[PDB]
Every structure is written in structure tokens, then in C-alpha cells.
Enzyme design. Structure first.
Site, PDB file in Angstrom:
ATOM      1  N   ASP A  57      62.195 107.355  69.655  1.00 40.75           N
ATOM      2  CA  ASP A  57      63.573 107.396  69.436  1.00 40.75           C
ATOM      3  C   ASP A  57      64.415 107.795  68.839  1.00 40.75           C
ATOM      4  O   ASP A  57      64.021 108.525  67.747  1.00 40.75           O
ATOM      5  CB  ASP A  57      63.497 105.827  68.500  1.00 40.75           C
ATOM      6  CG  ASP A  57      64.767 105.073  67.574  1.00 40.75           C
ATOM      7  OD1 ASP A  57      66.041 106.253  68.047  1.00 40.75           O
ATOM      8  OD2 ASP A  57      64.278 104.312  66.462  1.00 40.75           O
ATOM      9  N   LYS A  59      67.739 108.021  68.853  1.00 43.66           N
ATOM     10  CA  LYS A  59      69.238 107.354  68.425  1.00 43.66           C
ATOM     11  C   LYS A  59      69.561 108.198  69.694  1.00 43.66           C
ATOM     12  O   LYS A  59      71.124 108.051  69.047  1.00 43.66           O
ATOM     13  CB  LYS A  59      69.648 107.671  67.691  1.00 43.66           C
ATOM     14  CG  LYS A  59      68.671 106.710  66.150  1.00 43.66           C
ATOM     15  CD  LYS A  59      68.939 105.271  67.105  1.00 43.66           C
ATOM     16  CE  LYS A  59      68.308 104.355  65.797  1.00 43.66           C
ATOM     17  NZ  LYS A  59      67.088 104.352  65.171  1.00 43.66           N
ATOM     18  N   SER A 113      70.767  97.987  60.643  1.00 40.74           N
ATOM     19  CA  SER A 113      70.079  97.414  59.440  1.00 40.74           C
ATOM     20  C   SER A 113      71.072  97.386  58.294  1.00 40.74           C
ATOM     21  O   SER A 113      70.934  96.754  57.391  1.00 40.74           O
ATOM     22  CB  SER A 113      68.760  97.219  59.502  1.00 40.74           C
ATOM     23  OG  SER A 113      68.340  97.101  60.271  1.00 40.74           O
ATOM     24  N   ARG A 186      57.705 102.696  56.440  1.00 38.48           N
ATOM     25  CA  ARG A 186      56.944 102.898  56.018  1.00 38.48           C
ATOM     26  C   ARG A 186      56.207 101.618  55.209  1.00 38.48           C
ATOM     27  O   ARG A 186      55.009 102.246  54.679  1.00 38.48           O
ATOM     28  CB  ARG A 186      58.178 103.182  54.512  1.00 38.48           C
ATOM     29  CG  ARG A 186      59.006 104.660  54.956  1.00 38.48           C
ATOM     30  CD  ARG A 186      59.964 104.998  54.025  1.00 38.48           C
ATOM     31  NE  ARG A 186      61.084 103.924  54.669  1.00 38.48           N
ATOM     32  CZ  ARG A 186      62.659 104.190  54.153  1.00 38.48           C
ATOM     33  NH1 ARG A 186      62.228 104.599  53.197  1.00 38.48           N
ATOM     34  NH2 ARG A 186      63.240 103.107  55.081  1.00 38.48           N
TER      35      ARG A 186
END
Lengths: 210, 210
Positions: A57, A59, A113, A186
Site C-alpha cells: 500500500d 496509495k 477514514s 497501531r
């Protein structure tokens, strides 16, 4: 089986990952890791791991030539995340052709998000997703309404949902809303015992799912 | 003085870059280079170079925590390119605060050069740019109308324009439309003699500009 994709944005040891291997669906490798460990060390770290999916990822959000130049240096990965908003012609179409020829999966970012993510271009993004027909799509875990709606709009697509734990997502809520897998960073890699936290989160999810 | 920013998406030797140094405004470092040379070798390559700007372009497009985790591993850079479309709250605002504290410039992507780039969210993107107030913005070199309009809408902003050469941009046309600098990659680094091509392109531009 686990519904968790580890967002490894900080280094975890090889031994830790080997226990997680059969209690993760996948591992999502980001730029923070590749810049911390470096490319060679990152590839070594991922070698023996038996997970369904190794997802890179970065992006991806550039023209096709550049996105292809990036992913060809990351062949250890099964799958790659790119942004839908960059569009098709001269960007995602060229990347899709490339990944198809090289037996790689594409996941497209549909909803993020954070609060700053605009809802205004859902129709455009859905159209991009329809043209490209990726393996999967990323729908934010804080954005439960959108998860259910994307599940409705794309019944066969793999839906993966980050934002669980630190960003607000209560574990298992995204899966219950219609996601296939939850992306968790996390909450696991910053825990005292990352394996223990993964096991606890897995338990929470398999309870909710049921 | 040169108006060219080298898009170094393929390795060039240190000796070559040293001649270019006083005939470039800047050098734009991408993921293809960092993945080819690796992080350590990439940093070494850029050390002695006397250019106004070393720009890192990973087309940043994530939540704030992740974007900050990326750029803190790239402190050799003066400036960083991020996408406007990701929005402000919990993404670009957090990155801006970080870059400000660390004396770095931010450039935001406003318009890209590929056909698939949607024009539909110009108002949203302009608003994002207005809230964040970056050092500069990236406006595609194939998109001349948009360059002039962005120059009108943002008179004080640095405007940088890729897509010159291979992607269609005729050298100097972006500057003439209102851009400050032109970003040029393949036209230089894939030329028989990259220094000769840079000098020729510089000549073309200083003629057009005048």
C-alpha cells in the site's frame, strides 16, 4: 480463520510474524516500513510468511508509467492498493493491464477514514471502480454506512477496511457492516505484546461476526 | 536561470547531476528512483547538489499520521508533493503542521496531465488549496487552460508543471501559460546525452519565455 490484515507501518520481527502468519489473512506493507527498513530488508522480512495476501500500500496515485515503474520493483507482493480518484485513462487502465499480466491483484481506495475525506465524488469513484473491476476496494472502517452500501453496490468485490482501533473503528464493526477483512495497525504493532493483542482482537472479531 | 525541474525517476550519475545543478531550478525525486537505488543510495546521490529545490514526490495521499511517518524519513528534501484530493482534516492539516515545524515546503497536486484525471472537482481542490496555503501547486503541462486559471486564482503560489516532452507538453508552453517551472523527466534522463538535452530544452524555454 482470521479477518485481520496487519498494517505493518512499523517493523515487527520475523519470529513475531511467523506466529501471526496463521492468524492473519494478510499483511499490508506501507511506505513507512520500506523507508525505515529499506527495500532489501523489507523483502527479506516477508519471504517465508504463509499468509493469503501480501499487499503493498503506497496509495498509488500517479500516471500509468510511474505506477508501473513503482510496482515492478515490488514483485514480492500479491496485491497493490491504488487510489480510485486518479481515474482510468492513462493511469489506472495501464496499471491494471500491467498487474493482470504479472498475476497481481489490484485494490482501489473508495472511502478513507479521516474527516477530511470528501464524500462528494462517490459516484465518480464508483464509476472508476466499475470500469477497472479490481479484486478489491478499500472502504474506511470509521465509515460504516459506506461499507454496507459498497457491499450492496459491489457484492462480489473483496472489501477491506482500515481505521480499526486507533482511528476509532471498534474491532469487528467493519466486518459486521459488510467488509471482508479489517486492516489494523497501531492496535497491534504498538501493543506491549503484538501477538497477544492480535489474538485478543481476533477473539473480539469472531464473537461479533457471530 | 533555468525553469526546469528534473524528474529523476531513473538513476543519473553524480557527475551528470553536478553539471545540471546550475542549470536546473530543482530535482524531483520519485518512488521509482528510491525503489531502484534504495533509500541510502538515494540520499547519497543528492548530497552535494546545489539546486534551489530538492522535491520528494511520492504523491502523498494518506491520513496525516502515515504521511508524517513517510516524510520524516526523507529529511534531505526541501519540499514534498501531496495530493489535494485527500482533503484537510486528519490528512493535509496534520502534514502541513509537521512540514512547517520542520522547515519544509508543501506542493499540492491540483491537476494531472493524463486524460483520466477528472475536472469535476476543481472547486473542491481549489478550496483545499486555499485552506492549506501550500508553497506551491502542481498543474499538468498538458492542461494549459488550467495553468492560466490557477495562475489567476493563486497569483503568489509557485506553479510547477509536469507532462512536458513525452506526455505531450511542448517545452516552454507551461511557463508561457503561467507556470513557474516545468517538470521534465524522460526527455532528459532517457536522452543519449542528458546534459545536452537539458541544455537544448533550456534554450527552447528561454526563447519561448521571451
Amino acid at each position: 480463520k482470521s479477518r485481520v490484515i496487519l498494517a505493518m507501518d512499523k517493523p515487527l520481527s520475523y519470529q513475531v510474524l511467523k506466529e501471526m502468519e496463521n492468524e492473519l489473512y494478510g499483511i499490508k506493507v506501507g511506505l513507512p516500513l520500506v523507508l525505515d527498513l529499506g527495500v532489501d530488508k523489507t523483502r527479506e522480512l516477508l519471504i517465508g510468511l504463509d499468509v493469503e495476501e501480501i499487499i503493498v500500500d503506497f496509495k498509488l496515485a500517479d500516471i500509468g508509467y510511474i505506477m508501473k515503474s513503482i510496482v515492478e520493483r515490488l514483485s514480492f507482493a500479491n496485491s497493490f492498493i491504488a487510489h480510485s480518484f486518479i481515474g482510468v485513462k492513462g493511469s489506472l487502465d495501464e496499471l491494471k493491464r500491467y498487474l493482470d499480466a504479472n498475476s497481481k491483484n489490484l485494490y482501489l481506495v473508495a472511502v478513507m477514514s479521516h474527516e477530511g475525506w470528501s464524500t462528494l465524488f462517490a459516484d465518480y469513484i464508483k464509476n472508476v471502480i466499475r470500469e477497472i473491476s479490481p479484486k478489491g476496494i478499500v472502504v474506511g472502517g470509521t465509515k460504516l454506512d459506506h461499507i454496507t452500501q459498497y457491499r450492496r453496490d459491489f457484492e462480489k468485490m473483496t472489501i477491506v477496511s482500515p481505521g480499526m482501533g486507533s482511528q476509532g473503528g471498534s474491532y469487528g464493526d467493519a466486518v459486521c457492516a459488510g467488509a471482508d477483512y479489517e486492516i489494523i495497525g497501531r492496535s497491534i504493532y504498538n501493543a506491549g505484546n503484538p501477538l497477544t493483542a492480535l489474538r485478543t482482537i481476533n477473539k473480539i472479531i469472531e464473537d461479533k461476526v457471530m
